[PDB]
């Protein structure tokens, strides 16, 4: 059972390089518009406390160099929507997929296409943490890399990358330019709120470990939803809602394990530990698979 990213080709065809001054990062080119982080317009000194509206009015279209491979695209207009800069260019991207912009919920997963200088570098699956960070792999020059999900042939973009926090986690916006979380695109040290574990996802992953014939963790005990949630919250796990229980049905039916029976198993693991043993390889409980993720990977989408 594998953490699996969406095929990235439809997104690769949209990545371009955007430069302003000595600053270079990635942009996303959809039809005749290039989307990128607005802090591209900032110098070193600008980044410590940037008045973006002020810095933006002092720029011309010709301050922005956009490159699709070897080809420069001419910027014929620019505007700003929250923390994203939109650069209108004179050519349409014929590789534009069917797409939508979505804001994802904490606990949901998406694929990241990490890019440098407009060139795709790697792809991997991430979850929006409850504290609205993401545990990504992003180096200098990764900004403007995007996160996405694919449904049929439609790409739903949900994340654009802007920053790293001192703990090594990452923060960014949706494609409307609104940050996930209480962060700001200024070069200052920013801490996140206390993170919590995505309980419905841990439960999905336990079911997966069962489906792959691993069940040392199961038990005869059982629990009410509320008593589970009391213990969950004590251990900085998110509460489990009835809709979460509903979502887990399919995995429940599949294995013949009632959701609340699996909650009892997870409660025992929280309280006792893994006593050295491991599940699907991991010394640690995994919380970045949604129920959909586990199912779709026992379906074949």
Ligand X SMILES: *[C@@H](O)[C@H](C[C@@H]1CCNC1=O)NC(=O)[C@H](CC(C)C)NC(=O)OC[C@@H]1CCC(=O)N1Cc1ccc2c(c1)OC(F)(F)O2
Q: How far is the CB of 40 from ligand X (least distance, A)?
A: 8
Report strand pairing: 98-101 vs 154-164. Answer: parallel
189 binds, among its own copies, ligand X, none (CB under 5 to 8 A by kind): ligand X
By CB under 6 A, tell whether 81 contacts ligand X.
no
Specify whether 78 is catalytic. no
**Nearer Cβ to ligand X, position 94 or 166?**
166
Catalytic residue among 14, 20, 39, 78: 39
Binding mask 93-132 for its own copies (x = CB under 8 A): --------------------xx-x---xxxxx--------
- Residue with the two structure tokens 């900085």: 236
Interface residue with ligand X, options 8, 36, 39, 266 (CB under 6 A)? 39
Q: State the Cα–Cα distance between residues 179 and 181, nearest whole angstrom.
A: 6
Residue 142 as a binder of ligand X (CB under 6 A): the answer is yes
76 token code pair: 């014929």
- Which of helix, strand or coil describes residue 108? coil
Q: Which is nearer to ligand X, 72 or 167 (CB)?
A: 167
68 contributes a contact to ligand X by CB under 6 A = no
In whole angstroms, what is the distance from residue 198 CA to residue 104 CA? 14
* Position 163 contacts ligand X (CB under 6 A): yes
Per CB under 6 A, does 244 bind ligand X?
no
Q: Which residues pair with 72 in a beta bridge?
A: 67
Q: Which does 8 bind (CB under 5 to 8 A by kind): its own copies, ligand X, none?
A: its own copies
Residue among 212 and 241 whose Cβ is closer to its own copies:
212
Query: Per CB under 8 A, which of residues 18..37 are in contact with its own copies?
Result: none
Closest CA to 39 of 164, 187, 181, 167: 187
* 185 vs 40: CA distance, rounded Å: 11
190 binds ligand X (CB under 6 A): yes
Instruction: Work out whether 138 is an interface residue with ligand X (CB under 6 A).
Output: yes
Q: What is the residue whose two structure tokens read 């720029």?
A: 59
Q: What is the CA radius of gyration of the chain?
A: 22
Distance CA 31, CA 29 (A): 7
The answer to whether residue 174 forms part of the interface with ligand X (CB under 6 A) is no
Which of 70, 140, 194, 299 forms a contact with ligand X (CB under 6 A)? 140
Q: Give the up-direction half-sphere exposure of residue 134: CA atoms within 13 A in the CB hemisphere.
A: 31
Strand partners, 120: 115
Q: Which of 24, 158, 176, 181 is nearest to 85 (CA)?
A: 176
In angstroms, rounded to a whole number, what is the distance separating the alpha carbons of residues 127 and 119?
Answer: 23
Annotated catalytic residues are: 39, 143
What is the contact surface with ligand X in residues (CB under 6 A)? 25, 39, 42, 47, 138-140, 142-143, 162-166, 168, 170, 185-187, 189-190
Residues at the interface with its own copies (CB under 8 A): 1-10, 12-13, 113-114, 116, 120-124, 135-137, 139-141, 168, 212-213, 278, 282-284, 296-298, 300-301
């Amino acid at each position: 059972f594998r953490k699996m990213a969406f095929p990235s080709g439809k997104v690769e065809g949209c990545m371009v390089q955007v430069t302003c001054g000595t600053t270079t990062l990635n942009g996303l080119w959809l039809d005749d518009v290039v989307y990128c982080p607005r802090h591209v317009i900032c110098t070193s000194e600008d980044m410590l406390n940037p008045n973006y509206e002020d810095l933006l009015i002092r720029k011309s279209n010709h301050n922005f160099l956009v490159q699709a491979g070897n080809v420069q695209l001419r910027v014929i207009g620019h505007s700003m929507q929250n923390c994203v800069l939109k650069l209108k260019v004179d050519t349409a991207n014929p590789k534009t997929p069917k797409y939508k912009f979505v804001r994802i919920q904490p606990g949901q997963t998406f694929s990241v296409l990490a890019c440098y200088n407009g060139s795709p570098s790697g792809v991997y699956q991430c979850a929006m943490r409850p504290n609205f960070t993401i545990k990504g792999s992003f180096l200098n020059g990764s900004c403007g890399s995007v996160g996405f999900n694919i449904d049929y042939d439609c790409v739903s973009f949900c994340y654009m990358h802007h920053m790293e926090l001192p703990t090594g986690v990452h923060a960014g916006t949706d494609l409307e330019g609104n940050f996930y979380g209480p962060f700001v695109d200024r070069q200052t040290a920013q801490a996140a709120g206390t993170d919590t574990t995505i309980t419905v996802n841990v439960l999905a992953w336990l079911y997966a470990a069962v489906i792959n014939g691993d069940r040392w963790f199961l038990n005869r005990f059982t629990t009410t939803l509320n008593d589970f949630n009391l213990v969950a919250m004590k251990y900085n796990y998110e509460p489990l809602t009835q809709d979460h229980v509903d979502i887990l049905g399919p995995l429940s039916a599949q294995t013949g394990i009632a959701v609340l029976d699996m909650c009892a198993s997870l409660k025992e693991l929280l309280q006792n530990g893994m006593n050295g043993r491991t599940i699907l390889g991991s010394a640690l409980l995994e919380d970045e698979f949604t129920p959909f993720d586990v199912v779709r990977q026992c379906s074949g989408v």
